[PDB]
């Protein structure tokens, strides 16, 4: 509900559309299990989409730690000091790519 959840007003970071559009996404941190099914499609993401996505927007830093993890992770850190961590456990390549585009598109 809305009385149990805190609310805010619509705003921007530093008037993001006035002079120029600044990509508000600093970073992204996948942790990818080399041997593990849970990061399986995520591995294929590292095989196929992450290079093209990185060349699509040079203002974003992408780290793949490739540690022996059990749940793979994307960490979208932003210009205003906000960090949003999401799990890419057992999700397909195209839908992970849409999630990454969601992370890049937002503030």
């Amino acid at each position: 509900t809305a009385r149990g959840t805190p609310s805010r007003f619509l705003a921007s970071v530093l008037h993001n559309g006035l002079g120029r559009y600044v990509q508000q996404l600093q970073r992204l941190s996948f942790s990818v299990s080399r041997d593990g099914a849970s990061s399986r499609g995520a591995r294929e993401f590292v095989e196929r989409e992450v290079i093209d996505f990185a060349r699509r927007n040079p203002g974003v830093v992408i780290y793949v730690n490739s540690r022996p993890c059990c749940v793979p992770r994307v960490v979208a850190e932003y210009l205003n000091g906000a960090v949003r961590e999401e799990s890419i456990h057992c999700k397909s390549v195209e839908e992970i790519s849409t999630l990454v585009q969601k992370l890049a598109d937002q503030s």
Binding site: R34, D35, G36, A37, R40, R43
Partner: protein, 51 residues
């Protein structure tokens, strides 16, 4: 009415007949779908790893 009862007799029987043969052909072609080796091997793909 633009037509009498005698004028309208049989004037759209052809289209009704073809519509019924179409829905009949749709009804009589209910039969289980094909199976592929590629789907079985694609589920075999669940333990792809890196090297």
């Amino acid at each position: 009415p633009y037509m009498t009862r005698e004028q309208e007799r049989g004037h759209a029987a052809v289209r009704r007949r073809e519509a019924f043969e179409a829905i009949k052909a749709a009804a009589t072609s209910k039969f289980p779908p094909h199976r592929f080796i590629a789907d079985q091997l694609d589920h075999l793909n669940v333990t792809k790893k890196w090297s």
